[PDB]
């Protein structure tokens, strides 16, 4: 198989396969070990952030992409946002400071 | 004047650190939410639209087309903040009943059934209260003291159901027997951390006994967490327990009829329905012996919602295999929840050999590259002219 | 959308009544088709082929 | 005794049972005991002359329609039809039962209602009799909660002194000289104080009025009644808590329709609460043949309404059980299976409303139902969400600004600028043809035409060679 | 949410409660001292000038703002024009009105007994200038009450608190006016029992 | 008469910063409108007959004269549609009718007690004005507006506001100019700007 942009899951915005285009590899816990192991830390900000997960951050990285411009402006994954609704969820109260 | 500067950082909290966490108030768990739900059903059956005041509301989290509002009266462009004055709905997108909250008002308190059966028992050790005597209360079979003045009764007596009926004949004041889960948020409500704080901080200097002044200290050291941290004692009696937003629990349609629910419109429905009709038996006046087994039959549904299991595993009903709450959602499959992902651009095939290749160079078969390397194609087609818009690229590489 | 109905404007682009959904073969695959079956549900005409 | 004991059920006979069941001859003894209890509110109404007063604007508007006969009346004890014959038995007593205080103040005015007794109401207004000088204690009680905390907290006088002069009466000028009298600090300081103590008692002084009574009487009006209330609350809670048991041995034919067991014992208690409220025992059947209607009323009524996700209504689970009842006795005469159109010809329904009525019944299958083989999946990973769209299909509307900013912008000034303002290119809302007339000031039918004219110059072609390749 | 720090006599916070009640908003309100509210909103209200609204994200202080605010997103029913021509015409008729009339009210209450008959009576003629004009239309030039006369409602019911009145002429074509809108349910359920003892409506 | 036409009526001002501030919205619109610089003491006849209460600006369009800094401004950006000028989201909007509040009535008064103030306030204002307009400082690095990717109305109560920033004796000072003051190079020299410009008020650009 092979994927380069498809389908995206319901409830965690991820990919998997269901609509003609399977989903991606399986970039599991076991291989982030071995891209902190070198101090590999741009791949692996973007393997997580632009390439799975962000909603309005990888609709950016498509558009740098076809004009040439290699660049990417992160954001925040929205598989944290629901684990901030999903503790709130309990009693318990989690939020972010600012600074 | 750093408020417009605040407001621009005020919106902005994605720099940031230090995510902080601590107990939950009912004066702010009722200031997440923008609306109460009131009724236990979810959808139409008819013309699928969310009905109102539901579980899947539109008036409260939010509409479900994108820049419409329910009814179909405010479809243009020219109306995209207001609110319909018909079917409440604002008129924005539907990314946003996403990330709305509402709350359920519950007609009785009823303990966070984390800080009552974690081993170390939150409530108990905040009281000095063997836990099997808490949970001899929370079920409504034993009654317990309150503010006991001048008798022979202490504060945490565990009157049974004779003691008090052959204590409340020689007194009617000066005197408070209460039972159930609205008595744990008395105890906790009038204690007081400072009195029995450093009241026990020489009670723990005269008690000599390597056992006694070696967990002494440790109850002296969760009264000092109480006070610094800024949470009352009072607030792991849940008030309003708030429900989680209506697209991290989807009803999604599949196809051919059938529909998928998540396994929390099968718990949520559990509790607006026990708590609807406690709402009733205290209007329509019942005796003591059922309205006392409601609350005891509400307390087993909020509790069989934040981590189902640790009771009688209220199994799912049309099915055989127990459900799944909120936080059995958080907990370990090895793996987080979170991140520590699927990954977009990979493909996988079977290794060969290759011997006349270089020490760093793989080979990639011609069907793979040619779709990993999409976005970048269509970079050279509309920049070397050969494809004048995107769209007859994606024609060309077809 | 706004910008997009003028360019229908421009040309005459009849809008679509009806959305294709039609079964193409799924990619990388080719063969004869060498066998086709029609059910119907009892109350609703049968077409030619069928 | 409680030997680790969790589920609620195990809970709930633990103490159900510790009650002992009724004889028949108990039973007529209960509602024997009820019966004098509502009697003891009811007949403690008529001691209200404003009981009436109530009704009296009822049958002063019923013929003149502000009152209907099905929430006042039900047929005497012991319309025009009915009617004109009681109330009108009233009409002779109503105002005429009080020429002696317009001595006997007290017998007119009773006897105005002391014959009330054979007057029969409705469920409707009972309410408000009860409602009314409900509040009327709270619009003299706790406004008595002042005079107290103003001689105890105010005044430094105790407060179960002066009760003695001017409670139950709550209207004469007692401590004006009764409690001002005793040469203390307070009592002449009441006086002192001696306006908020009988201006906050006026409005109560209208409640004597607002009654034609006295203070007095008002409080024999409405706390002899309370008593007849509580006189039937233990009376009616010693039958749900005797036929309690019986609850349970109707409710365990139901136990599997979606509903846990214990929500459903307790729909019955709502049930059997009501049959004791409305229980009659003249007519002879005893209590079991009444409660197990009210009781099975009940959980079949429940059920209906919090069983499935999606809701069906009450008057179509009807439907749908007909046609399982009915598809399953199809089953064994016809023995091989039943069609789609037999149960049109078995039935009578218009052969596609049962293709309407098999399309509901369907559950939702749960997102976490562990697809083959039993890996480490689940459902809610294969169902792709629609919402979203193709960063392709976001990425040609991002380019088509590219070309209706240049294609657009290779036109003329005057000639483009309504062209973008007769759709809503680049803009808010879009606009109304002569609604642009005001904008250029220049109104008539050339709008129609500069966008008519300059909108073909753009549809010729090499002005249209970027902007046409976008169709299909 | 919604929340609103109005005064529980000014004719500011007057204005804003007969938009709320008018428009159906599910608000609560949370009342001022005398019209100073406590020293715990200057956080959100840097200026500390009631009324103010809360709702959520917002923070706004002024009776323009916080007035035309619940016209422009509660659209029905609407308190302003259709087309541009006559907003202007309304949204400078209450330009008026803000100030010439509402600021000659100082002297009235917090002017002495001197200019209180400074300006008592040199208002008085104007009170009967557009009197006659009420045989055109049924409100204040509107078939249809709007947000024009919001401005009125809460001032004419100042009158017997402020002392000038009606008497002979200014009261023919005048009156009517009170008599037709003291009624709606929107000016009738905002009413307060502090703004209420200023007449015996 | 004046409105005799479909064209509008301006008795503008030659310097009073009402004429400036309206007449950026008013040219930015693409209308021809008459530019008429009046004075208080002697402005033309029709500015004191139908304007009976006699302010600057103001503006006459066939029906009567519109008095004011806000009704006008405000009339134009809702009669003369395109381009646009204020958002479309009541909730973003209003705020928008805000900060034009909390400039009217924060920065204004520091321009008329520097016109008629004493020799400190003439500093102790510019005291109180030059470092809390440096208190806005990082506003711009976000936003290449007042917190509005658009030229919107709210921009345009600044400008006018910023260019008589010498005029009456300010200058700049501290660290982060480059980000407010090479600011100033984005919106003092547009077609809205740049054409509007009364030249008296340019003569103290130099
Ligand atoms: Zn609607």
Same mark, same amino acid.
């Given at each position: ?99 | ?6 407001? @621009?950082?005020? %919106? ?26 009131? @009724?236990?059903? %979810? ?107 001048? %008798? ?7 009157? %049974? ?238 | ?50 | ?472 | ?57 917002? +923070? ?54 001197? *200019? ?8 008085? *003629? ?65 009413? +307060? ?9």
């Amino acid at each position: 198989h092979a994927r380069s942009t498809g389908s995206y899951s319901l409830v965690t915005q991820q990919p998997l396969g269901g609509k003609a285009q399977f989903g991606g590899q399986r970039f599991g816990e076991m291989e982030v070990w071995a891209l902190e192991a070198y101090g590999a830390a741009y791949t692996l900000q973007e393997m997580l952030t632009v390439k799975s997960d962000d909603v309005n951050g990888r609709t950016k990285m498509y558009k740098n992409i076809v004009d040439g411009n290699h660049q990417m402006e992160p954001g925040m994954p929205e598989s944290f946002n629901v684990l901030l609704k999903e503790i709130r969820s309990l009693g318990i109260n989690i939020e972010l400071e600012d600074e | 004047k750093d408020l417009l500067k605040f407001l @621009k950082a005020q %919106t902005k909290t994605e720099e940031f650190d230090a995510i902080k966490i601590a107990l939950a108030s009912p004066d702010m768990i009722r200031s997440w939410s923008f609306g109460e739900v009131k @009724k236990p059903e %979810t959808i139409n059956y008819r013309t699928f639209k969310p009905e109102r005041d539901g579980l899947f509301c539109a008036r409260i989290f939010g509409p479900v087309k994108d820049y419409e509002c329910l009814c179909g009266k405010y479809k243009r462009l020219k109306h995209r903040g207001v609110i319909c004055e018909k079917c409440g709905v604002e008129v924005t997108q539907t990314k946003v009943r996403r990330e709305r909250m509402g709350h359920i008002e519950l007609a009785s308190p009823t303990a966070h059934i984390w800080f009552l059966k974690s081993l170390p028992s939150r409530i108990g050790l905040l009281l000095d209260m063997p836990l099997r005597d808490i949970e001899r209360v929370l079920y409504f079979e034993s009654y317990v003291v309150i503010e006991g003045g001048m %008798t022979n009764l202490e504060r945490q007596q565990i009157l %049974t159901e004779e003691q008090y009926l052959d204590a409340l004949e020689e007194f009617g004041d000066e005197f408070d027997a209460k039972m159930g889960a609205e008595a744990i948020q008395a105890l906790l409500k009038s204690m007081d951390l400072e009195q029995e704080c450093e009241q026990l901080r020489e009670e723990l200097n005269e008690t000599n006994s390597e056992t006694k002044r070696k967990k002494l200290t440790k109850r002296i050291k969760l009264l000092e967490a109480f006070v610094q941290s800024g949470n009352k004692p009072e607030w792991m009696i849940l008030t309003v327990l708030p429900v989680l937003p209506p697209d991290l629990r989807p009803l999604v349609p599949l196809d051919g009829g059938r529909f998928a629910t998540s396994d929390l419109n099968d718990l949520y429905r559990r509790v607006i329905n026990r708590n609807n009709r406690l709402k009733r038996l205290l209007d329509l006046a019942a005796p003591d012996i059922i309205v006392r087994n409601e609350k005891r039959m509400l307390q087993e549904a909020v509790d069989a919602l934040l981590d189902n299991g640790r009771r009688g595993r209220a199994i799912t009903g049309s099915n055989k295999r127990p459900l799944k709450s909120l936080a059995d959602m958080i907990k370990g499959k090895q793996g987080r929840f979170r991140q520590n992902k699927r990954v977009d651009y990979s493909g996988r095939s079977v290794i060969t050999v290759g011997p006349y290749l270089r020490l760093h160079q793989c080979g990639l078969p011609k069907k793979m590259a040619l779709e990993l390397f999409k976005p970048f194609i269509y970079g050279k087609l509309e920049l070397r002219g050969l494809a004048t818009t995107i769209k007859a690229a994606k024609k060309m590489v077809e | 959308t706004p910008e997009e109905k003028l360019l229908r404007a421009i040309f005459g682009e009849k809008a679509s009544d009806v959305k294709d959904s039609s079964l193409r073969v799924p990619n990388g695959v080719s063969g004869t088709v060498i066998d086709v079956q029609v059910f119907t549900r009892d109350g609703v005409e049968k077409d030619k082929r069928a | 005794e409680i030997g680790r004991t969790t589920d609620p059920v195990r809970m709930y006979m633990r103490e159900m049972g510790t009650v002992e069941l009724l004889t028949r001859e108990g039973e007529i003894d209960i509602a024997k005991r009820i019966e004098d209890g509502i009697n003891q509110v009811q007949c403690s109404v008529a001691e209200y002359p404003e009981a009436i007063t109530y009704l009296l604007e009822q049958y002063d508007r019923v013929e003149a329609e502000e009152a209907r006969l099905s929430d006042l009346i039900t047929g005497f004890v012991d319309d025009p039809e009915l009617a004109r014959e009681k109330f009108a038995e009233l009409r002779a007593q109503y105002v005429v039962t009080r020429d002696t205080i317009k001595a006997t103040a007290q017998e007119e005015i009773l006897k105005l209602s002391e014959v009330f007794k054979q007057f029969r109401l409705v469920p409707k207004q009972f309410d408000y009799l009860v409602n009314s000088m409900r509040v009327m204690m709270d619009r003299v009680r706790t406004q008595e909660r002042l005079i107290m905390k103003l001689c105890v907290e105010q005044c430094k006088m105790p407060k179960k002194n002066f009760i003695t002069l001017f409670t139950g009466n709550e209207t004469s000028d007692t401590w004006f000289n009764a409690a001002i009298a005793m040469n203390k600090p307070w009592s002449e300081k009441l006086h002192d104080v001696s306006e908020e103590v009988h201006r906050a008692l006026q409005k109560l002084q209208q409640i004597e009025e607002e009654t034609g009574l006295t203070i007095e009487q008002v409080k024999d009006i409405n706390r002899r009644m309370s008593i007849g209330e509580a006189k039937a609350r233990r009376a009616k809670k010693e039958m749900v808590e005797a036929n309690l048991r019986l609850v349970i041995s109707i409710a365990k034919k139901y136990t599997n329709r979606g509903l846990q067991f214990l929500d459903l014992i307790q729909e019955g208690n709502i049930g059997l609460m009501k049959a004791v409220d409305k229980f009659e025992y003249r007519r002879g059947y005893k209590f079991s043949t009444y409660a197990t209607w009210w009781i099975r009323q009940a959980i079949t009524r429940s059920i209906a309404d919090q069983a499935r996700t999606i809701r069906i209504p009450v008057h179509m689970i009807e439907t749908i059980n007909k046609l399982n009842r009915i598809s399953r006795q199809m089953l064994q005469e016809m023995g091989r299976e039943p069609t789609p159109e037999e149960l049109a010809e078995r039935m009578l329904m218009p052969e596609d409303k049962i293709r309407k009525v098999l399309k509901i019944a369907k559950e939702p299958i749960s997102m976490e139902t562990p697809i083959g083989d039993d890996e480490d999946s689940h459902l809610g990973d294969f169902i792709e969400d629609t919402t979203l769209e193709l960063p392709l299909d976001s990425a040609t509307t991002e380019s088509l600004r590219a070309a209706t900013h240049d294609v657009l912008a290779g036109l003329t000034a005057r000639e483009a600028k309504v062209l973008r303002m007769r759709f809503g290119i680049d803009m808010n809302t879009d606009y109304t043809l002569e609604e642009v007339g005001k904008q250029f000031d220049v109104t008539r039918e050339r709008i129609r035409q500069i966008e008519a004219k300059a909108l073909r110059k753009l549809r010729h072609p090499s002005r249209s060679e970027v902007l046409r390749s976008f169709l299909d | 949410v919604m929340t609103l720090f109005s005064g529980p006599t000014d004719i500011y916070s007057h204005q804003v409660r007969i938009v709320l009640a008018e428009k159906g908003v599910s608000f609560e309100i949370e009342h001022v001292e005398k019209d100073n509210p406590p020293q715990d909103l200057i956080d959100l209200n840097p200026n500390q000038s009631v009324p103010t609204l809360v709702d959520r994200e917002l +923070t706004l202080w002024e009776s323009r703002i916080i007035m035309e605010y619940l016209d422009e997103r509660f659209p029905h029913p609407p308190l302003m024009p259709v087309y541009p021509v006559a907003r202007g015409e309304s949204r400078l008729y209450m330009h008026r009105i803000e100030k010439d009339w509402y600021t000659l009210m100082n002297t009235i209450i917090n002017g002495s007994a001197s *200019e209180a008959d400074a300006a008592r009576k040199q208002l008085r *003629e104007e009170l009967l200038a557009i009197a006659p004009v009420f045989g055109q239309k049924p409100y204040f030039l509107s078939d249809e009450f709007s947000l024009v006369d919001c401005y009125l409602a809460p001032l004419l019911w100042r009158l017997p608190q402020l002392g000038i009145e009606f008497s002979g002429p200014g009261a023919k074509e005048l009156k009517g006016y009170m008599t037709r809108v003291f009624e709606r349910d929107s000016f009738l359920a905002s009413l +307060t029992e502090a703004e209420r003892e200023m007449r015996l409506g």
